Homo-oligomer: A and B are copies of this chain.
Amino acid sequence: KFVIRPATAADCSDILRLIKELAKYEYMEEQVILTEKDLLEDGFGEHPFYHCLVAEVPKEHWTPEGHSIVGFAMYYFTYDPWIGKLLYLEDFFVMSDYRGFGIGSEILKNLSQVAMRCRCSSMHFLVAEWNEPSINFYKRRGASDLSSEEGWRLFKIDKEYLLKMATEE
């Protein structure tokens, strides 16, 4: 059927392909600026800024375009001053013609083992408020909505504004 395993440098082309496919899936249309070079340098350079798990399918079940990777999960470690190291799930995506096979649940299982192995007190991630199916999917597994409970809002300051603060009076 398929296997869930850590990504290797050779998988970066597959990951970018899936990221671009994910970007298309999304509704919040945004351009993917990442290049395979970035994924290689940032993930398999001196310091890994992200980690990926990939879902590989048997050679005789490849993608119509001849691809063995049909899914991926990107994560990294974060830190909380109160409790310490946390696991952060950035994104999770499985190709359309491969959903409903359990791949998604297997990735989640593997991420949970990573959390256990790396001594993470919990796993954080974002869910769009309008995505009720996903909200319930996670709540059914014990997830808590911290934005709803504690009022947290995600803020961002772009490079343009960062540059101003970096070089101001």
Contact = CB atoms under 8 A, between A and B. Distances in A.
Interface of A: 19, 22-23, 28, 30-34, 38, 42, 47, 49-50, 74, 76-85, 87-88, 90-91, 108-109, 112-113, 115-116, 120-130, 135, 138, 141-148, 150-166, 168
Given A33-B84, A34-B81, A152 B123 contact: no
17 contacts: A34-B82, A34-B84, A38-B84, A42-B84, A42-B85, A74-B79, A76-B77, A76-B78, A79-B90, A81-B91, A115-B166, A123-B156, A125-B155, A128-B150, A135-B153, A142-B164, A146-B155
A31 B156 CA distance: 28
Taking the full assembly, how many copies of this chain does it contain?
Answer: 2
A150 B34 CA distance: 21
Interface class of chain A by DSSP? mixed
A45 to B, nearest CB: 11
Most chain B beta-carbon contacts within 10 A, residue among A112, A115, A164: A112
Nearest to A31: B82
A153 B128 contact: yes
Contact of A145 (B145, B153, B162): B153
